[PDB]
Design a protein around this nucleic acid. Structure first.
Length: 430
DNA sequence: ATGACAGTGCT
DNA sequence: AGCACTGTC
């Protein structure tokens, strides 16, 4: 009734750079622009691993995870850009620096949470209030929303994509100006206007295109972002949620794409997010735990409270390398050389981080994987990170893992190592 | 023989 | 603290 919270208190956006690593390489090499293109990591084994794919290449069936030799079978004209290799390993510095470019532009408009190297959540609630004052009750023109889709529209009583988009936007804005929508709907709409301006600034100032979702919380904003790509943005209103969720597979909602989502499907015998509304909160808690149950109860009604955290910078700075199949590290000299390679990249990134961001890491996490273990990590151990010195970090890492060598000799390493991982964590102001 | 990243939550 | 889980390009 009048005491039922509807989760309409915030305006939240999720901005996602379209096939980001590809765009970085296309900006640098114009010959790659507007072509089927992919970014490949390494090159010797089966042509290298594809890690990013342009939308033109996706139309041929090229996907991430694919071996480049296989991608070329689907797309013979596929162009490839190679990830930089330094100290024997893939080095993602170019993409990290490009991400900083975008995040600094986004930070001019609103509070941002860096979700990944190319996604940020945006809390627009305050900016929308400000913009609503300036407008002075003047209606919002469709020209302010030139790339916005309104999910669920058009409805009721053109066979072209852009024409559908405009029809839906007109229906939305017409009902807005007649006062047939709600005050949260107006807030979302102003939020979308700001996101158009943010995306325009990103493209003008970096060359990069992005897509975005605008809704009342992070889960709906992320879901919204994926509905119309590339280079478009989608507004998911609270009212659109029942129809949207009625055929939405549970795995599409963030945090339900793995084992928990699979258990929701199996235990409850349902397929779609909207089907969750038929269970009580206590029922859901009894199957999935207190926290998950409460979260699911609210989420299937379009409600989520997870805040956009004010976090511009990554919380960890890590370096890793796999050694699959025959390349597994089988000797002590190997392990120490590679630990040094990883530690040297980490030292370089850590020193740069300290200069730019006035912070120092205090913990070094060391993880390895041994040949045979089905889990991605076999062992994780931490030690103090007291100096940004690669030779010290590599020695400390060796010290904390050396006991895992169950081999007879000190010169051999068994069972061989299929992964080394160093991660600097626990940052303090400096 | 996807890799190389990253953040959150459990116990 | 060490690990499992979930997500990114």
């Amino acid at each position: 009734g009048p005491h039922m919270a509807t989760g309409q208190d915030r305006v939240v956006a999720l901005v996602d750079m379209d096939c980001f690593f590809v765009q970085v390489e296309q900006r640098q090499n114009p010959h790659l622009r507007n072509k089927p293109c992919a970014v490949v990591q390494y090159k010797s084994w089966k042509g290298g691993g594809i890690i990013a794919v342009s939308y033109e290449a996706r139309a041929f069936g090229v996907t991430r995870s694919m071996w480049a030799d296989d991608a070329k079978k689907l797309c013979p004209d596929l162009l490839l850009a190679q990830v930089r290799e330094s100290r024997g390993k893939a080095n993602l510095t170019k993409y990290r620096e490009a991400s900083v470019e975008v995040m600094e532009i986004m930070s001019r408009f609103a509070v941002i949470e860096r979700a990944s190297i190319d996604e940020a959540y945006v809390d627009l609630t305050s900016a929308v209030q400000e913009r609503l004052q300036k407008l002075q009750g003047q209606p919002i023109s469709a020209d302010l929303l030139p790339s916005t889709y309104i999910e669920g529209l058009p409805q009721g009583p053109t066979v072209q994509k852009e024409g559908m988009r405009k029809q839906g936007l007109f229906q939305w804005l017409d009902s807005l100006q007649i006062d047939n929508l709600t005050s949260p709907d107006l807030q979302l709409t102003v939020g979308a206007v700001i996101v158009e301006e943010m995306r325009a600034a990103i493209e003008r100032e970096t060359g990069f295109q992005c897509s975005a979702g605008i809704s009342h919380n992070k889960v709906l904003a992320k879901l919204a972002c994926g509905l119309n790509k590339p280079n478009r943005q989608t507004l998911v209103s609270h009212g659109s949620v029942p129809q949207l969720f009625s055929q939405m597979p549970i795995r599409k909602i963030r945090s339900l794409g793995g084992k928990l989502g699979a258990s929701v499907i199996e235990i409850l015998g349902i397929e779609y997010m909207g089907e969750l509304t038929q269970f009580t909160e206590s029922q859901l808690q009894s199957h999935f735990g207190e926290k998950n149950g409460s979260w699911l109860y609210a989420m299937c009604r379009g409600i989520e409270h997870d805040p956009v955290k004010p976090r511009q910078l990554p919380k960890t700075i890590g370096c890793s390398k796999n050694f699959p199949g025959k390349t597994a590290l089988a000797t002590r000299e190997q392990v120490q050389w590679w630990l040094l390679q990883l530690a040297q990249e980490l030292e370089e990134r850590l020193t740069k981080d300290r200069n730019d961001n006035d912070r120092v890491a205090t913990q070094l996490v060391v993880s390895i994987r041994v040949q045979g273990d089905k889990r991605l990590s076999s062992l994780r151990r931490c030690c103090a990170l007291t100096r940004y010195d690669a030779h010290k970090m590599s020695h400390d890492a060796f010290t904390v893992i050396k006991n895992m060598n169950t081999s007879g000799i000190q010169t051999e390493w068994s069972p061989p190592l299929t992964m080394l991982f160093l991660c600097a964590t626990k940052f303090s102001a400096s």
